[PDB]
Amino acid sequence: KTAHSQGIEGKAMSEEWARYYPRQFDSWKKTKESDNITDMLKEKPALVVAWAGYPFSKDYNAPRGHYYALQDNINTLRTGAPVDGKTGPLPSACWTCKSPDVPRIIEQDGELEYFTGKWAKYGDEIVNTIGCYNCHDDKSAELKSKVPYLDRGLSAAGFKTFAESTHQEKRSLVCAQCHVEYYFKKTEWKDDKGVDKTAMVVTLPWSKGISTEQMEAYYDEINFADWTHGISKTPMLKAQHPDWELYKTGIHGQKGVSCADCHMPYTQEGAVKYSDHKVGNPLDNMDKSCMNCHRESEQKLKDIVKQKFERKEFLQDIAFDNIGKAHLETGKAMELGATDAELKEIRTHIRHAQWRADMAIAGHGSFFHAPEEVLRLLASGNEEAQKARIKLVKVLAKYGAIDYVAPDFETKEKAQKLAKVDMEAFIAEKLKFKQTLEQEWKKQAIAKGRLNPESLKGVDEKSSYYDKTKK
Amino acid sequence: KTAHSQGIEGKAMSEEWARYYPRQFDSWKKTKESDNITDMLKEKPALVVAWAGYPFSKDYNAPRGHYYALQDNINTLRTGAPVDGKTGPLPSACWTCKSPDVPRIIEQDGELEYFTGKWAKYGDEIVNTIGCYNCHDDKSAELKSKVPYLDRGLSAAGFKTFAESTHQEKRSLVCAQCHVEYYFKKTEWKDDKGVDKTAMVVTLPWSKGISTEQMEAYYDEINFADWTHGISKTPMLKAQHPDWELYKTGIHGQKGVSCADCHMPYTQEGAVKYSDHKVGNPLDNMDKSCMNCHRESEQKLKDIVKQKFERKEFLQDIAFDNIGKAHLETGKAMELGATDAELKEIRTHIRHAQWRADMAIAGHGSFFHAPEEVLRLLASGNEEAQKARIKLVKVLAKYGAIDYVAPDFETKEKAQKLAKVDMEAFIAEKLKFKQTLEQEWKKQAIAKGRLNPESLKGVDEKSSYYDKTKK
Ligand code: HEC
Ligand code: HEC
Ligand code: HEC
Ligand code: HEC
Ligand code: HEC
Ligand code: HEC
Ligand code: HEC
Ligand code: HEC
Ligand code: HEC
Ligand code: HEC
Ligand SMILES: [Ca+2]
Ligand SMILES: [Ca+2]
Ligand SMILES: [Y+2]
Ligand SMILES: [Y+2]
Ligand SMILES: [Y+2]
Ligand SMILES: [Y+2]
Ligand SMILES: [Y+2]
C-alpha cells in the first residue's frame, strides 16, 4: 500500500502529492521549461483560410508544456471574453483536458452537470493545470483514466477498457484521455430536481474504428458538422490532436512501445525505478528516450526525424494550398450565383479533403509517430481537394469566371482578412476579460483554497498576442 | 587463394564454377523456382496509357527469378522480331543487365563496340543468364562490378567507387550494376580501323545526385526525352527499376543493411558461412532474412509489409488515373486544334508527374525498401498531374469541350486500343521470330560451345502471351 491509502485531502492540487513523491513532483513541474509559443497561424496561414468561420481562425498555437495547459486554455482567443458565468463563446467541455479539477468536479456533480453550461461557468473552480490526479488514483497511486468518455470510446471501437488493459497499454491510455480527436455531442437530460438541461458531451468518434476514414464515415452517417465554412459554406469537420489514434498506426505503436517510453522514460537507481515526469520532446533526452532501444548516434537519429518532418511539410503545404483555393473558388462561385445544388458535390470533396489533411497534421507528433499514414492522408486529402477544384473550374466557367485566380493567403494578416477575422477587436476584448473577470477568478480561487499562487509563477507571460519576455 | 587462381576457362558459363562451389551453384540455380509471370499491363492497365508510344505499352511483366532474365529479354514484345543482326527495334544495350556474356564481350571488344549495333547483333553470343561472372572475379572470387557505367555514376554522385567501398557496401553495389535507373546516351566514336560509329551507352542519371528530383533536373537540363507520348505528345521520361536509388532513402539502407542481407542471407555451418544464392522473396524465408535482426512473429512482420503495399497501391492508382486522364485530355485538346504553345506548361506538368510516379513504382520492392519516399513521390506526381488537368479544363473550354470525359482504360484491352497497340500483330510477328531466328541463335550458340542446353530446361514455358503450363 501507499503512505496515503485513505486518499489525499486537496488531491486536485498536485502540490499535495509532493510530500509523498518529491521526485515525480519535481520533474512534473519542470514542464514549465517548455514555454515557447509557436503561432501556427503565422507559420501556416493557409490554416486560417481552412478554418474560416471557426474559432481556430482566430488563434491556434503549437502545444507547449503541461504547466501551461490551463492558462493557455484561458489565454487563447478561442475562448473569447466572457463577462460572467453565463457568457462567452465556448462550453464547459473546454476545461475537460486541462485540469485535475475536472475529475474532481465530475466526481462531485456528475458527468452531465459538468458538461452543462458555459466555459466561464467553472472559471473560479477549474484552476489547476494537468496534474497527478489526472492520471493517478489518490489512494493506490496506480494509473487510471478519470474520464468516462475514453472507456466509452474504447468499447465502441472494440478495444478493451482501461481496467481491462495491460500495464504497458495503460502507459499510453492515460495520455489518451486527452490526446485524441473528439466532438461535442449535444445531449438533453434532466437533473434530480426535474429541470431540463442541455449538455455538450465530449465524445470520441470511434464507433466505427479509429482510422481517419472510419471516423469520416462516422461523422457523415450522422450528418455532423463542426461549423459551416465562412467562405465556401461547406459543412466542415474539425480534427483535434488525434495523437493516440495516429500513433496506433505507427510501427512503435504496433510494436507496443508506449507514449511513456519516449516522453516519460525511466531512470534506474539501484532497485528504484523513476519515471521522468517532465513530459516534453524526447529528442532533448535521446539517451533515455531512444538509445535504450536503438544503437545509433543521436545526431543521425535526429537527422532521420528531421527528414520525416520535411516530408510532411512538403505534402502539408500542397494539400492546404489546394484546400484554401477550393474554399475561395467556391466562395467566388457563390458570389456569381452558383446554387447549393451545383456546389453540393464540390463541398463534399472539400469536407473530406480537409478532414483527412487536418487529421494528418492536427497531431503535431504524427509525422514521426505514424509517418506513412500521415503522408498517405495528406495525399488523399489533396486529391479530394483537386477533384473539387477541377469541378469548380466548370462551375466558374458556367458563370463567366473561368480565369478567376483565388487570392493569395501567404501571411496570417492576409489570410485573416479573407476569413474576415477582426483580430484587433478580439484581442482588445480578450485583454479586458483577463484584466477583470480572470483576475477575479484567480483571486476567488485562491481565497477559497482551490488555487495555490505558487503554481502561477511565470504561467502568464506569453500568448500569441503578447510576450512579457522572460522565463 | 582460391582453387582457380589463374582464372576459369569458360567463365561466362556459371556451370563452370560448380566444381569449385557446388553449394552456391545449387542455390543459384534455384531461382528457376520463381517462374511466375505477372502481366503488369493486365494488373495496371493505366500503365498502358502512361506508356503510349513506347515499347512498355506492348509488354511489361513483374520480375521473376534470375534464371529467366535472358529468356525474358528475348520473349518480351519490347525487343520485337529481328530478322537478322541488323534489324529489330532495340539496341545492343538491352543485353547489358541480363547475362555474364556481357562483361565477357565488353572485355573482349571494348565498351563502345559492345554498345554499338542492334540487340539482334549478339543473339548467338549473349546466351547465358545472370551468372557467377556478373558479380565475381574468376580468379579471387571476390565481389566485383563488371560494368564501367556504375563507377562512372557513383563518382558523378559523389559516392566512392566499387573498389573504394566497404565490403558491406559491395554486398549492395554488385546488385546496383543492374538494379538502377538509367538511360541510353547516344555516343559517337571511331574504331581503331577509323570507321565512324554510333553507340547507345547505358548511363546512370546521377550527376546531380540519386534522388528522383535530382534525376529530374538532370534530364531537364539536357532536354532529354525517352519518347514523345503517342497520345499527348509530351516529351516523356521512363523510369526503370531504380531499386538501389530508392533503397538508399529507406531506413534499412541508411542503417547499412545490404541487399544481400535480406535477399541472400547467410547460413552458418560451424566455421563455414554460406550465402543463399537463390535470390528471391525474403518473406518466403523470413527466419533467415528478417528474424536475424527482428524479434517478432513472422505473420505480424508479413502483415506490416502487406500494409505498406496497400498504402502504395492506394496512391499508385490515384496518380496513374489522373496521369492517364491528363494524357487523354491533352490528346483531345490537340484534336480540337490547341497549339503546342497552349499545351507547353501542361506537357511539362505531365512529364514531371509521370517521371515521379514511375520512379516510385518502377522499383517493385520500393514500397517496402523506402515506403516514405514512395508515398511522397506518388503524392507529388499526382499533384503535378492535377495541376495539368486544372489547366487542361481551361484549354478544353476554350475549344468548346469543357465537359469532355476522358475515356476509361480499366482493362488492358481498352487501354491498348487507346494507345493504338496492335497486339495480335506484334505477337504473331514475335512467334515467327522465336520459331526461326531465335532457335538458330540457340543452335549456333550450342554448336560453338557458348551455351549449355542444360540451362534451357523449362526456361521458355511462359511469357505474357503464352503459357505451356508446368514447371
Ligand atoms: C474547447 C473547444 C477547447 C478549448 C478552447 C481548448 N481545448 Fe484543448 N488540447 C488538448 C490537447 C491534448 C492539446 C495538446 C496537443 C495539441 O494542441 O495538438 C490541446 C491544446 C489546447 C491549447 C493549446 C494549443 C492551441 O493554442 O490550440 C488550447 C488553447 C486548447 N487546447 C483549448 C485536449 C483537449 C481535449 C481533450 C479531449 C478537449 C475536449 C479539448 N482540448 C478542448 C479544448
Ligand atoms: C533494353 C531497353 C532492355 C530490355 C528490352 C530489357 N531490359 Fe531490363 N531489367 C533490369 C532489371 C534489374 C530488371 C528487374 C527488375 C524490374 O523489372 O523491375 C529488368 C527486367 C527486365 C525484363 C523482365 C520484366 C519485364 O517484363 O519488363 C525484361 C523483359 C527486360 N528487363 C528487358 C535491368 C536492366 C538494365 C540494367 C542497367 C538495363 C540496361 C536493362 N534492363 C535494359 C533492358
Ligand atoms: C489531459 C488532462 C492531458 C493528459 C492526461 C496528457 N496531456 Fe499532454 N497535453 C495536454 C495539453 C492541454 C497540452 C497543451 C499544453 C499547452 O498549454 O500548450 C499538452 C501538451 C503535451 C505535449 C507538448 C509538450 C511541449 O510541447 O513542450 C506533449 C509531448 C504531451 N502533452 C504528451 C503527453 C503524454 C505522452 C501524456 C501521457 C503520459 C500526456 N501528454 C497526457 C493535455 C494532456
Ligand atoms: C499523466 C499524464 C501523468 C501525470 C500528470 C502524472 N503521472 Fe505519475 N506516472 C505516469 C506514468 C505513465 C507513469 C509510469 C507508470 C509505470 O508503472 O510505468 C507514472 C508513474 C508514477 C509513479 C511510480 C514511480 C515512477 O515510475 O516514477 C509515481 C509515484 C507517480 N507517477 C507520481 C506522480 C505524481 C506525484 C504526479 C504529480 C506531481 C504525477 N505522477 C503526475 C503518468 C502521470
Ligand atoms: C524501445 C522500447 C523503443 C524506443 C523507446 C524507441 N524506439 Fe524506435 N523503434 C523501436 C522498434 C522495436 C522499432 C520497430 C522496428 C524493429 O526494429 O522492430 C523502432 C523503429 C524506429 C524507426 C524506424 C521506422 C521509421 O519510422 O523510420 C525509427 C527511425 C526510430 N525507431 C526512431 C526512434 C527514436 C528517435 C526514438 C526516440 C524518440 C525511438 N525510436 C524510441 C523501439 C523503440
Ligand atoms: C517514441 C518512439 C515516441 C512515442 C512512443 C510517442 N511519441 Fe510523441 N513524439 C515523439 C517524437 C520524436 C516527437 C517529435 C519531437 C520533435 O519535436 O520533433 C513527438 C511529438 C509528440 C507531440 C508533439 C509535441 C509538440 O509539437 O509540441 C505530442 C503531443 C506527442 N508526441 C504525444 C505523444 C503521445 C500522447 C503518444 C502516445 C499516444 C506519443 N507521443 C508516443 C516520440 C514518441
Ligand atoms: C544484372 C546482371 C543483375 C544483377 C547483377 C542482379 N540482378 Fe536481380 N534481376 C535482374 C533481372 C534482369 C531480373 C529480372 C528477371 C526476369 O526474368 O524477370 C532480376 C530480378 C531480381 C529479383 C526478382 C526475383 C523474383 O521475382 O523471383 C530480385 C529480388 C532481384 N533480382 C534481386 C537482386 C539482388 C538483391 C541482387 C544482388 C545480390 C541482384 N538482383 C543482382 C538483373 C540483375
Ligand atoms: C551477384 C548478383 C551474384 C551472383 C550472380 C553470384 N554471387 Fe556469389 N555472392 C554474392 C554475394 C553478395 C555474396 C556475399 C558476399 C559476402 O562476403 O558477404 C556472394 C558470396 C559467394 C561466395 C562466398 C561464400 C558465401 O558467402 O557463400 C562464393 C564462393 C560465391 N558467392 C560463389 C558464387 C557462384 C559459384 C555463383 C554462380 C553460380 C555466384 N556466386 C553467383 C553475389 C553473387
Ligand atoms: C538486420 C541486418 C536487418 C535485417 C536483415 C532486416 N531488418 Fe528490418 N530493420 C532493421 C533495423 C536496424 C531497422 C531500423 C530501425 C532500428 O531499429 O534501428 C529496421 C526496421 C524495420 C522496419 C521499420 C521501418 C518501416 O519501414 O516500417 C520494419 C517494418 C522492418 N525492419 C521489417 C523487416 C523485414 C520484414 C525484414 C526482412 C525482409 C527485415 N526488416 C530485415 C534491421 C534489419
Ligand atoms: C530487407 C530489409 C531488404 C533489403 C535490405 C532489400 N530488399 Fe528487396 N525486397 C525486400 C522485401 C521484403 C521485398 C518485398 C517482398 C514482397 O514480395 O512483398 C523486396 C522486394 C524487392 C524486389 C521486387 C521483387 C519482385 O517484385 O519480383 C526487388 C527487385 C528487390 N527487392 C531488390 C533489392 C535490391 C537490389 C536491394 C538493394 C538495393 C534490396 N532489394 C534490398 C527486402 C529487402
Ligand atoms: Ca473533432
Ligand atoms: Ca530511364
Ligand atoms: Y497535505
Ligand atoms: Y511544443
Ligand atoms: Y517507416
Ligand atoms: Y571446367
Ligand atoms: Y517476382
Side-chain angles (χ1 to χ4, degrees):
Chain A
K1 66 170 62 178
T2 66
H4 56 83
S5 63
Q6 262 66 208
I8 299 176
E9 196 183 332
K11 47 185 163 54
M13 296 175 277
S14 296
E15 28 277 74
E16 287 296 331
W17 299 60
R19 70 179 295 155
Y20 301 110
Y21 311 111
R23 289 284 298 177
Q24 291 79 185
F25 179 77
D26 176 283
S27 62
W28 165 85
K29 180 146 65 175
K30 289 186 182 305
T31 58
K32 175 186 181 179
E33 291 168 29
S34 300
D35 75 318
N36 151 274
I37 289 295
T38 290
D39 182 338
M40 290 306 299
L41 299 186
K42 184 165 297 179
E43 212 67 53
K44 300 298 184 184
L47 297 182
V48 171
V49 173
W51 301 323
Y54 200 60
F56 280 72
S57 64
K58 300 197 289 186
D59 196 2
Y60 172 58
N61 310 131
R64 57 172 173 165
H66 278 171
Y67 185 88
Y68 305 99
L70 195 289
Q71 193 58 48
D72 288 341
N73 183 245
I74 291 174
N75 296 346
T76 183
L77 297 180
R78 303 209 294 281
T79 47
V83 292
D84 56 33
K86 297 175 182 177
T87 48
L90 307 182
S92 56
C94 284
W95 296 108
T96 313
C97 310
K98 303 290 183 296
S99 165
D101 281 302
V102 174
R104 174 177 68 77
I105 295 177
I106 287 178
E107 285 157 25
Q108 182 191 70
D109 302 310
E111 210 183 325
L112 295 176
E113 178 56 48
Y114 165 69
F115 284 128
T116 303
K118 289 288 186 177
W119 169 71
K121 175 189 177 190
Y122 295 118
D124 60 45
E125 282 295 316
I126 301 176
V127 297
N128 291 278
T129 192
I130 313 301
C132 319
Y133 200 56
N134 279 114
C135 311
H136 294 286
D137 178 280
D138 74 314
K139 291 174 184 175
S140 64
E142 291 181 302
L143 293 178
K144 288 257 187 176
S145 166
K146 308 303 189 72
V147 288
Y149 60 72
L150 177 57
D151 274 335
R152 196 171 295 147
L154 288 169
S155 296
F159 278 108
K160 286 176 284 59
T161 62
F162 186 100
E164 297 169 50
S165 305
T166 69
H167 185 64
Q168 178 66 181
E169 295 183 308
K170 291 182 181 183
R171 281 162 61 70
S172 285
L173 293 177
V174 288
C175 304
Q177 303 179 76
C178 311
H179 284 272
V180 296
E181 144 64 11
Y182 74 95
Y183 77 100
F184 296 145
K185 184 173 183 177
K186 188 180 180 184
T187 307
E188 303 304 320
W189 68 295
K190 180 176 61 181
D191 58 41
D192 51 54
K193 293 182 179 181
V195 180
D196 294 303
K197 298 175 182 177
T198 300
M200 289 299 266
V201 184
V202 171
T203 307
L204 309 188
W206 303 353
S207 64
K208 290 180 177 299
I210 61 163
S211 83
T212 292
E213 288 68 33
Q214 286 162 165
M215 287 187 226
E216 192 178 83
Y218 169 109
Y219 284 124
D220 286 346
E221 194 178 78
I222 62 176
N223 303 305
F224 187 79
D226 284 292
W227 85 104
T228 297
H229 204 268
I231 298 169
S232 67
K233 255 51 195 174
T234 299
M236 308 301 288
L237 290 177
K238 182 74 186 79
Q240 284 103 339
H241 42 62
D243 309 304
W244 185 80
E245 298 95 318
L246 268 290
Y247 144 84
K248 277 297 193 176
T249 72
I251 187 64
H252 286 104
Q254 285 182 288
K255 299 306 300 180
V257 179
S258 72
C259 311
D261 285 310
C262 297
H263 290 289
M264 288 185 64
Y266 298 130
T267 283
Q268 193 62 56
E269 294 190 359
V272 179
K273 182 195 300 178
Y274 292 116
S275 292
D276 187 343
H277 279 62
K278 177 181 182 297
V279 175
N281 186 338
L283 302 183
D284 293 317
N285 181 51
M286 293 187 83
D287 194 290
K288 288 289 175 297
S289 301
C290 315
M291 303 317 133
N292 201 296
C293 301
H294 294 287
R295 298 180 298 298
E296 174 61 298
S297 63
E298 292 177 50
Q299 187 52 62
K300 287 183 178 60
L301 214 58
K302 281 186 176 181
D303 293 330
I304 290 178
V305 175
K306 186 181 183 301
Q307 288 167 38
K308 300 183 186 296
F309 187 74
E310 303 180 301
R311 214 120 50 186
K312 183 277 290 190
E313 285 283 293
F314 179 72
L315 295 188
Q316 168 172 173
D317 291 342
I318 290 170
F320 278 98
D321 185 50
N322 285 319
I323 286 173
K325 289 179 178 176
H327 280 300
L328 294 169
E329 295 166 344
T330 296
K332 174 68 175 182
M334 287 160 64
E335 206 171 67
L336 298 170
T339 65
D340 291 333
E342 295 180 306
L343 301 171
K344 188 169 186 177
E345 279 174 35
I346 284 169
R347 285 170 172 157
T348 293
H349 281 128
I350 290 168
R351 169 188 169 90
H352 289 162
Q354 191 166 313
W355 166 246
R356 300 175 192 178
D358 201 4
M359 276 293 283
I361 73 163
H364 291 274
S366 295
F367 78 94
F368 170 80
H369 300 155
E372 299 182 13
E373 202 47 37
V374 165
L375 298 184
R376 191 190 65 71
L377 288 171
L378 284 168
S380 181
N382 186 240
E383 172 57 9
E384 283 298 305
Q386 292 291 232
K387 283 184 172 186
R389 300 194 59 233
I390 287 170
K391 291 179 178 178
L392 277 165
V393 177
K394 306 189 194 311
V395 174
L396 289 173
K398 172 182 178 182
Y399 289 97
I402 196 170
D403 296 314
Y404 170 72
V405 179
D408 294 307
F409 39 96
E410 83 281 9
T411 71
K412 175 181 176 180
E413 294 59 52
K414 295 178 178 178
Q416 286 191 138
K417 186 176 182 299
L418 295 174
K420 296 174 181 172
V421 174
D422 188 348
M423 285 289 275
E424 293 184 297
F426 289 126
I427 291 174
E429 194 195 23
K430 189 72 175 185
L431 292 181
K432 183 146 62 179
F433 155 71
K434 290 177 57 63
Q435 307 171 325
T436 58
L437 220 215
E438 194 203 330
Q439 303 310 302
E440 290 304 300
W441 282 355
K442 287 180 162 53
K443 291 177 182 181
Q444 293 169 178
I446 291 175
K448 295 182 299 176
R450 293 300 192 189
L451 171 62
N452 184 319
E454 267 299 312
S455 71
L456 305 179
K457 292 196 182 305
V459 80
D460 193 30
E461 305 183 4
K462 304 176 174 182
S463 72
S464 61
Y465 49 101
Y466 65 72
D467 185 338
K468 301 173 183 178
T469 305
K470 70 287 184 178
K471 327 217 70 57
Chain B
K1 66 170 62 178
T2 66
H4 56 83
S5 63
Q6 262 66 208
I8 299 176
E9 196 183 332
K11 47 185 163 54
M13 296 175 277
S14 296
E15 28 277 74
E16 287 296 331
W17 299 60
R19 70 179 295 155
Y20 301 110
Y21 311 111
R23 289 284 298 177
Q24 291 79 185
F25 179 77
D26 176 283
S27 62
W28 165 85
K29 180 146 65 175
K30 289 186 182 305
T31 58
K32 175 186 181 179
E33 291 168 29
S34 300
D35 75 318
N36 151 274
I37 289 295
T38 290
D39 182 338
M40 290 306 299
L41 299 186
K42 184 165 297 179
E43 212 67 53
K44 300 298 184 184
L47 297 182
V48 171
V49 173
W51 301 323
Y54 200 60
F56 280 72
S57 64
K58 300 197 289 186
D59 196 2
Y60 172 58
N61 310 131
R64 57 172 173 165
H66 278 171
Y67 185 88
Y68 305 99
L70 195 289
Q71 193 58 48
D72 288 341
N73 183 245
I74 291 174
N75 296 346
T76 183
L77 297 180
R78 303 209 294 281
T79 47
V83 292
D84 56 33
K86 297 175 182 177
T87 48
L90 307 182
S92 56
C94 284
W95 296 108
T96 313
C97 310
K98 303 290 183 296
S99 165
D101 281 302
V102 174
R104 174 177 68 77
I105 295 177
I106 287 178
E107 285 157 25
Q108 182 191 70
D109 302 310
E111 210 183 325
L112 295 176
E113 178 56 48
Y114 165 69
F115 284 128
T116 303
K118 289 288 186 177
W119 169 71
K121 175 189 177 190
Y122 295 118
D124 60 45
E125 282 295 316
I126 301 176
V127 297
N128 291 278
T129 192
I130 313 301
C132 319
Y133 200 56
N134 279 114
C135 311
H136 294 286
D137 178 280
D138 74 314
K139 291 174 184 175
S140 64
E142 291 181 302
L143 293 178
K144 288 257 187 176
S145 166
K146 308 303 189 72
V147 288
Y149 60 72
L150 177 57
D151 274 335
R152 196 171 295 147
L154 288 169
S155 296
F159 278 108
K160 286 176 284 59
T161 62
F162 186 100
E164 297 169 50
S165 305
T166 69
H167 185 64
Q168 178 66 181
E169 295 183 308
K170 291 182 181 183
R171 281 162 61 70
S172 285
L173 293 177
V174 288
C175 304
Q177 303 179 76
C178 311
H179 284 272
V180 296
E181 144 64 11
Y182 74 95
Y183 77 100
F184 296 145
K185 184 173 183 177
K186 188 180 180 184
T187 307
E188 303 304 320
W189 68 295
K190 180 176 61 181
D191 58 41
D192 51 54
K193 293 182 179 181
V195 180
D196 294 303
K197 298 175 182 177
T198 300
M200 289 299 266
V201 184
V202 171
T203 307
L204 309 188
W206 303 353
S207 64
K208 290 180 177 299
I210 61 163
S211 83
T212 292
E213 288 68 33
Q214 286 162 165
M215 287 187 226
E216 192 178 83
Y218 169 109
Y219 284 124
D220 286 346
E221 194 178 78
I222 62 176
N223 303 305
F224 187 79
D226 284 292
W227 85 104
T228 297
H229 204 268
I231 298 169
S232 67
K233 255 51 195 174
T234 299
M236 308 301 288
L237 290 177
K238 182 74 186 79
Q240 284 103 339
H241 42 62
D243 309 304
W244 185 80
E245 298 95 318
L246 268 290
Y247 144 84
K248 277 297 193 176
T249 72
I251 187 64
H252 286 104
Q254 285 182 288
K255 299 306 300 180
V257 179
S258 72
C259 311
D261 285 310
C262 297
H263 290 289
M264 288 185 64
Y266 298 130
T267 283
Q268 193 62 56
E269 294 190 359
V272 179
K273 182 195 300 178
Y274 292 116
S275 292
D276 187 343
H277 279 62
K278 177 181 182 297
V279 175
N281 186 338
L283 302 183
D284 293 317
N285 181 51
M286 293 187 83
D287 194 290
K288 288 289 175 297
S289 301
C290 315
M291 303 317 133
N292 201 296
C293 301
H294 294 287
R295 298 180 298 298
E296 174 61 298
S297 63
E298 292 177 50
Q299 187 52 62
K300 287 183 178 60
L301 214 58
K302 281 186 176 181
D303 293 330
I304 290 178
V305 175
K306 186 181 183 301
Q307 288 167 38
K308 300 183 186 296
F309 187 74
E310 303 180 301
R311 214 120 50 186
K312 183 277 290 190
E313 285 283 293
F314 179 72
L315 295 188
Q316 168 172 173
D317 291 342
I318 290 170
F320 278 98
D321 185 50
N322 285 319
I323 286 173
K325 289 179 178 176
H327 280 300
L328 294 169
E329 295 166 344
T330 296
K332 174 68 175 182
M334 287 160 64
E335 206 171 67
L336 298 170
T339 65
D340 291 333
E342 295 180 306
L343 301 171
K344 188 169 186 177
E345 279 174 35
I346 284 169
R347 285 170 172 157
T348 293
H349 281 128
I350 290 168
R351 169 188 169 90
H352 289 162
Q354 191 166 313
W355 166 246
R356 300 175 192 178
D358 201 4
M359 276 293 283
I361 73 163
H364 291 274
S366 295
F367 78 94
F368 170 80
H369 300 155
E372 299 182 13
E373 202 47 37
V374 165
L375 298 184
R376 191 190 65 71
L377 288 171
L378 284 168
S380 181
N382 186 240
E383 172 57 9
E384 283 298 305
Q386 292 291 232
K387 283 184 172 186
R389 300 194 59 233
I390 287 170
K391 291 179 178 178
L392 277 165
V393 177
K394 306 189 194 311
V395 174
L396 289 173
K398 172 182 178 182
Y399 289 97
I402 196 170
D403 296 314
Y404 170 72
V405 179
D408 294 307
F409 39 96
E410 83 281 9
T411 71
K412 175 181 176 180
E413 294 59 52
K414 295 178 178 178
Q416 286 191 138
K417 186 176 182 299
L418 295 174
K420 296 174 181 172
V421 174
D422 188 348
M423 285 289 275
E424 293 184 297
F426 289 126
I427 291 174
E429 194 195 23
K430 189 72 175 185
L431 292 181
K432 183 146 62 179
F433 155 71
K434 290 177 57 63
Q435 307 171 325
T436 58
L437 220 215
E438 194 203 330
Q439 303 310 302
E440 290 304 300
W441 282 355
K442 287 180 162 53
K443 291 177 182 181
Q444 293 169 178
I446 291 175
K448 295 182 299 176
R450 293 300 192 189
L451 171 62
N452 184 319
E454 267 299 312
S455 71
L456 305 179
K457 292 196 182 305
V459 80
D460 193 30
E461 305 183 4
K462 304 176 174 182
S463 72
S464 61
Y465 49 101
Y466 65 72
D467 185 338
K468 301 173 183 178
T469 305
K470 70 287 184 178
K471 327 217 70 57

